[PDB]
DNA sequence: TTTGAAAATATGTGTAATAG
DNA sequence: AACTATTACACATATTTTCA
């Protein structure tokens, strides 16, 4: 569904994300080992709080990142992992114009599930575009979040309905290369004066990268854009010093909503970052 | 009358700035109404859950 | 020479610029819409709450 | 399998012919 | 005439999909 949901009453959580990057593979092509973890190992995600004892059906999905709604990504599909040394999860696979994945919840394992049956597959752009309803373009649209959910019925008869999802995650091969990207911002928020070191953590920062910062109406329009200085004099590999910049009428009342992104080139930016600036 | 290009060359440009500019406006506004639309969803889910006490 | 292939790509490339745009108007139609009757649903079951 | 790229498209820019 | 908006064309670039 593209129905909302939360992390619940209870919780399902992600104990181990996903690396930032996985080239997914397309239907022309020989099938990529499902999504790992930085570490090596494998996603993983857990259910707390639940004291009963019956096993559960967690489904994951391939949904939507970049700065929207959630939602099913359609350019892109589940694809059940062939097999590992040992045969680590069973799977399930289903639809409703999207595939999902189900793979039960063991209680005996705490409730916690290791993900290794989950790999990604790349629709052609042009054979979705096509589809009537669609109003999204492929083109230059690869980036995706791994989407769990769990359906506890209760003794009661309820269905308290669980949902969360990875960090994004970036499928093009070329982008994964290119565009840079944030994982880790040093802080969140500071006040109007600005002229504070935040420490900008993530992948592909070059020495032609440059700090923007924006302010966007409910209207969706840019009504501020100040470019932060960013100590290129020397620095770690990836990892970007940024000097917060002041922001435009120091005179604010309420605290103000901005966004800032990292640029390498005219068509090579970092998806937008969030910030805020309080008042004096 | 080499101009002519010169002058062209911004009518054109102008022309494609009106289709871009539009279009993303649109895409504004879509992108807005889904807020819209699931902040009203959760709210419904909250009161759906409120109500059944 | 190959500009045969190109002259059809362009042609759709364009065609399909424009009907983005139709299908993005319809959408809003369609959400202000639905919206509007979510945003009803709403108040409804407000005043039901605010009376249990 | 996994990696890197050529081969194939898709989209931007400057022109030219043409409608308005 | 003289000028701007429009649309298709060839070529340059940008991204995606197919192959090795």
């Known amino acids: ?280 | 009358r080499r101009i002519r290009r010169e002058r062209n060359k911004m009518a054109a440009a102008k022309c494609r700035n009106r289709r871009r500019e539009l279009t993303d406006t649109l895409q504004a506004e879509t992108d807005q109404l889904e807020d819209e639309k699931s902040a009203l969803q959760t709210e419904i889910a909250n009161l759906l859950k409120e109500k059944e006490k | 020479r190959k500009r045969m292939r190109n002259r059809i790509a362009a042609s759709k490339c364009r065609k399909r610029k424009l009907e983005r745009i139709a299908r993005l108007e319809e959408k809003v139609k369609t959400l202000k819409a639905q919206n509007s009757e979510l945003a009803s649903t709403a108040n409804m079951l407000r005043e039901q709450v605010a009376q249990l």
């Open chain 1, 1 to 280: 569904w593209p129905l909302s949901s939360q992390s619940g009453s209870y919780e399902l959580r992600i104990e181990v994300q996903p690396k930032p990057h996985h080239r997914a593979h397309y239907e022309t092509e020989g099938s990529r080992g499902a999504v790992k973890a930085p570490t090596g190992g494998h996603p993983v995600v857990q259910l707390h709080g639940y004291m009963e004892n019956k096993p559960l059906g967690l489904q994951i999905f391939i949904g939507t990142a970049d700065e929207r709604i959630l939602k099913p990504h359609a350019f892109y599909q589940v694809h059940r992992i062939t097999g590992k040394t040992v045969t680590t999860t069973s799977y399930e696979k289903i639809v409703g114009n999207t595939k999902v994945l189900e793979i039960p919840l063991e209680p005996k394992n705490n409730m916690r599930a290791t993900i290794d049956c989950a790999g990604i597959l790349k629709l052609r752009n042009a054979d979705i575009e096509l589809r009537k309803g669609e109003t999204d373009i492929g083109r230059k649209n690869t980036r995706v979040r791994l989407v769990f959910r769990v359906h506890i019925p209760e003794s009661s008869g309820r269905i308290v309905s669980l949902q969360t999802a990875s960090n994004p995650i970036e499928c093009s091969q070329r982008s994964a290369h290119e565009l840079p990207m944030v994982e880790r911002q040093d802080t969140d928020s500071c006040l109007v004066y600005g002229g504070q070191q935040m420490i900008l953590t993530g992948q592909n920062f070059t020495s032609e990268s440059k700090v923007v910062f924006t302010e966007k109406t409910t209207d969706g329009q840019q009504i501020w854009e100040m470019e932060a200085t960013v100590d290129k004099d020397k620095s770690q590999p990836n990892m970007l010093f940024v000097e917060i910049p002041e922001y435009r009428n120091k005179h604010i009342r309420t605290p103000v909503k901005v966004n800032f992104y990292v640029i390498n080139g005219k068509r090579k930016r970092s998806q937008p970052q969030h910030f805020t600036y309080h008042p004096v």
